[PDB]
Structure formats: structure tokens, C-alpha cells
Paper text:
Protein phosphatase 5 (PP5) is an evolutionary conserved serine/threonine phosphatase.
By contrast, a tilting of the TPR domain up to 10° is observed in the ligand complexed structure (RMSD: 0.84 Å) accompanied by a rearrangement of the αJ helix. These structural domain reorganizations are manifested in a reduction in the crystal lattice constant c by 15 Å. Inspecting the omit maps for both αJ helices ranging from Asn491 to Gly497 or to Met498 respectively, a considerable displacement of the Cα-atom of Gly497 by 6.5 Å is observed. This tilting of the domains and the changes in the αJ helix could well be the reason for the higher activity in the presence of P5SA-2. The ligand P5SA-2 itself cannot be modelled in the F0-Fc electron density map. The visible parts of the ligand structure imply interactions with the phosphatase domain at amino acids Glu428, Val429, Lys430, Ala431, Glu435, Met455 and Asn457. The modulate character of the P5SA-2 interaction would be in agreement with the NMR data of this complex, which suggested that parts of the ligand are not complexed by the protein. Substitution of the involved amino acids M455-G456-N457 to A455-G456-A457 and E428-V429-K430 to A428-A429-A430 resulted in loss of the stimulatory potential of the compound P5SA-2, implying that this pocket is indeed involved in regulatory processes, which are altered by the compound.
Author numbering: 23 to 149, 159 to 497
């Protein structure tokens, strides 16, 4: 009985979903849909599982299919509005929250989401540089503050070590210090090329980490397990420092501090989560407003805009958060020429560097995330050959073992956030490269305990569904 088979497969998918095994959830929903392609609940649950795995494009299409089947399926509208929020389609989301708060005026949840949506809409409408309406010198550190302070405005190794300790005890760096770090670090970054270039001599090493997503206690574990940064232990943090994790302020100010301390050996590349559309939904903007001000947040936003987009080691390995391009013929010079100081556009090379994913089949598809592309091994081979490169290192996707090697070895994924969001139970890893030998060496590690704060504790409700 085809329909009762579809239904058993959907029940298994629900089971997979609840166990946080979205990849199988998706697969069993997909098979359910294969047997009965005309049920709204199926499309709606698969839309939610695509949302959980940040596949906004696919969540959007499934939500739309669910709504086209049943105009009264309320879930369909929330999950459609979530996808659109994450895609920067704020007005589209509001239309759906409206259609809901309409079909029941009473709903507590409906109006809260509508209002939260309108507030972002209203702000973005509204939307000189923030530093100029700040008077950092005039601020005063209260006598009774006993946490870390800069040594005459300067970051040092002793400041970094006390900062790390202070944060471990869940305490807050005085706002004056936070401001100074931000201003200097803006100054450093705004000097960098869009493409950072590093030469590693025969005897030198470099560590590449992937996403860390505000997992502060895991970030300290990287440093214990692999050493503090210094001029003989350089690091690249390949984006997505913040969001989801509820210690994002602690992660980003530690990283920025180390960038000031070892500016030529501690490198930070922009990820898709160093952007407004992500930060307003996924916790960072809320965490910074809770702990500091809306003005601090606007400053973080403007610094993120100067983060370089890619890094090239010895002209042979190319590192970016996302992946390769929607278009053929993009060169390394083209990347160097990108005007990066902005939010990323909806498409184009800057967008692809932050957002794209590899796919196993040849060619290009519109991406499952609803922005940029998926690119096959023939895309990767042509770009490497055209540019005299050996392979790429990228991050952006959660991996069960903390890394993955795709495209015949030409596309490497590294991911540095173990037990991601307290739920995935994945290993994390970092890479060592060596000047004499640029083949990636992987080191895996597991999650470490942290205080009682939930992931997304500071985020609005727009992307917390189910
Ligand atoms: Mg990412
Ligand atoms: Mg990420």
C-alpha cells in the first residue's frame, strides 16, 4: 500500500529528525515524497530539516510546495518565512507572518514573530562610520573593575592570557577595552589585500581551523591542544567565528586580540556568519546587545567588512570559507581586486567565496542554501589548473569526523566546532600545513564542557522552529 508505505517512511524520518540526524531525516522524507508527492506534512517536515542544516533554498521550495498543497498549513508559512529571513528577503517573510497573524488574531507566537520581523524590516529601512559618534578616550574604567586592561592601549601576551581566563570564568571585558580592540583591529584589517598571501619556508608550519561558531570553551581546547598562537605557531581561522554558540563575544574578541598581537601570523578570513543577515537571526547581534550596546554591534559589523575573503599559501593552496565560483574564468587576481568592504552581494565572486559548496556530480547547480552555487570536481579541476594551484581548503559544512576530502583530493573541508550546537556529536579538526610539504595533516578533537547556556539563547525566535 503505497500511501501507508510513504507514511511509515515519514514516521522514520520524524524519528531521525528528533535524534538530530537530519541527513537521514531528509533521506527518509525524500523517499516518503517519492511514494506520495502530494502531502503538505511531508514537504513541511523536510523544509524544517533543510532549515536545521542551513539549506535555505531547499527549505524555501519545500515550504512553498506544502503551502501550494494546503493553504491552511500554518507550519508551511513559518518555515517559509524563516528561509526568507536567512536569505535577506525580509519583506517576503513579513507577508507570511502577516498571513498567519491574520488567520488567527489571537496567537501569541504569530504576533511576536510578526513584530520581530517588522523591527528588522524597519531597521534595515533606516539602514559616516560608527567610530566617529564614539568618544573612546572620554570613557572611564570604574576603580572597582578588576578584569583585563590594555597596557597603554596595546594588546600583549599577558593581556591575552588574563582575557582567556576571565572569559573562562564567564566574566565580561570592560567596554572601553572592547572598543579599543575593535578600532585597532579595524585599522589592521583595512590595510589587507582581499586575497592574503603567505609564504611558508621549508621549516615553517601553519594551522588552519574551520568554523568555531561561538564555542569558546572548544576554542580554548584548540589552543591547549595545538599551542597558543605566536610567530612560530601561525593560525588561519577560516570564518564563522560567531553565531549559534552562546559565547560568541568571547570567541571574537579573543581572535581579534591575537590578530593585533601577531598581525603577520594570525589570519582571519571572512565567513557567511560575519554578516548582518546571519547575525540578526543566529545569536551574535543579540549576544552583543545583551552584553554591550547596539553601537558595539554596529562596530563589529563594520570590522567584519574588512575581513579578507581568501588566503593563498606558496601560490599552491587556496583557502576560503565557502568555495569556488558560479562563473568560469575567475582568477586569483580577480579575488585580489574584489571590493570587499560591504555586505556580500546576492551573487558574484564575493558571494561565492562565502557561500558555495562542492557537489559530487559534474557541473554547477543553484545552491541548496539559496545563494551562490554548488560546484563539481570538473569546476574545481579547471579553476586549479587555470590558476596553477594544487587544491583548496574550505570550511562552512559540518562534518562528522571534523573534515572531508572531496573532488579527487582537490577540495578539502575543515570544521572546528565539535558537538556543534550541543547536538551534532561530531568530531572537530584542524589542519597542519608545512612549507616543505603542503599536504593537509588532520588532527581531530572532541568537545569540552561549558557553562549552562543554550545555543541560540540570545537569538530571536525566527529560526527556532519545531
Ligand atoms: Mg559557513
Ligand atoms: Mg558556519
Amino acid at each position: 500500500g503505497t500511501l501507508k508505505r510513504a507514511e511509515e517512511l515519514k514516521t522514520q524520518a520524524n524519528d531521525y529528525f528528533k535524534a538530530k540526524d537530519y541527513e537521514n531525516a531528509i533521506k527518509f522524507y525524500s523517499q516518503a515524497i517519492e511514494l506520495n508527492p502530494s502531502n503538505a506534512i511531508y514537504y513541511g517536515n523536510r523544509s524544517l530539516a533543510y532549515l536545521r542544516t542551513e539549506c535555505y533554498g531547499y527549505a524555501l521550495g519545500d515550504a512553498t510546495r506544502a503551502i501550494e498543497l494546503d493553504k491552511k498549513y500554518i507550519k508551511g508559512y513559518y518555515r517559509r518565512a524563516a528561509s526568507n529571513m536567512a536569505l535577506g528577503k525580509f519583506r517576503a517573510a513579513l507577508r507570511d507572518y502577516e498571513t498567519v497573524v491574520k488567520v488567527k488574531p489571537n496567537d501569541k507566537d504569530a504576533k511576536m514573530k510578526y513584530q520581530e520581523c517588522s523591527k528588522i524590516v524597519k531597521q534595515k529601512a533606516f539602514e559616516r562610520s560608527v567610530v566617529d559618534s564614539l568618544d573612546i578616550e572620554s570613557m572611564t574604567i570604574e576603580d572597582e573593575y578588576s578584569g583585563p586592561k590594555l597596557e597603554d592601549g596595546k594588546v600583549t601576551i599577558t593581556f591575552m592570557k588574563d582575557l582567556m581566563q576571565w572569559y573562562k570564568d564567564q566574566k565580561k571585558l570592560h567596554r572601553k577595552c572592547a572598543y579599543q580592540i575593535l578600532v585597532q583591529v579595524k585599522e589592521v584589517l583595512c590595510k589587507l589585500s582581499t586575497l592574503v598571501e603567505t609564504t611558508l619556508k621549508e621549516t615553517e608550519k601553519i594551522t588552519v581551523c574551520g568554523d568555531t561558531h561561538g564555542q569558546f570553551y572548544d576554542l580554548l581546547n584548540i589552543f591547549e591542544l595545538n599551542g597558543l598562537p605566536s610567530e612560530t605557531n601561525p593560525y588561519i581561522f577560516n570564518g564563522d567565528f560567531v553565531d549559534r554558540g552562546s559565547f560568541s563575544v568571547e570567541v571574537i574578541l579573543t581572535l581579534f586580540g591575537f590578530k593585533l598581537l601577531y598581525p603577520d601570523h594570525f589570519h582571519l578570513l571572512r565567513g557567511n556568519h560575519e554578516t548582518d543577515n546571519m547575525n540578526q537571526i543566529y545569536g551574535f547581534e543579540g549576544e552583543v546587545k545583551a552584553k554591550y550596546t547596539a553601537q558595539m554591534y554596529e562596530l563589529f559589523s563594520e570590522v567584519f567588512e574588512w575581513l579578507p575573503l581568501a588566503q593563498c599559501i606558496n601560490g599552491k593552496v587556496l583557502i576560503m570559507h565557502g568555495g569556488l565560483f558560479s562563473e568560469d574564468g575567475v582568477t586569483l587576481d580577480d579575488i585580489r581586486k574584489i571590493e570587499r568592504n560591504r555586505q556580500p552581494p546576492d551573487s558574484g565572486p564575493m558571494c561565492d567565496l562565502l557561500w558555495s559548496d562542492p557537489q559530487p556530480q559534474n557541473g554547477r547547480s543553484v545552491s541548496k542554501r539559496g545563494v551562490s552555487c554548488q560546484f563539481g570536481p570538473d569546476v574545481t579541476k579547471a579553476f586549479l589548473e587555470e590558476n596553477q594551484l594544487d587544491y583548496i581548503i574550505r570550511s562552512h559544512e559540518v562534518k562528522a569526523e571534523g573534515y572531508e576530502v572531496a573532488h579527487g583530493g582537490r577540495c578539502v573541508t575543515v570544521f572546528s566546532a565539535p558537538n556543534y550546537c550541543d547536538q551534532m556529536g561530531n568530531k572537530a579538526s584542524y589542519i597542519h600545513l608545512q612549507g616543505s610539504d603542503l599536504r593537509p595533516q588532520f588532527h581531530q578533537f572532541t568537545a569540552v564542557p561549558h557553562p549552562n547556556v543554550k545555543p541560540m539563547a540570545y537569538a530571536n525566535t525566527l529560526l527556532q522552529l519545531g
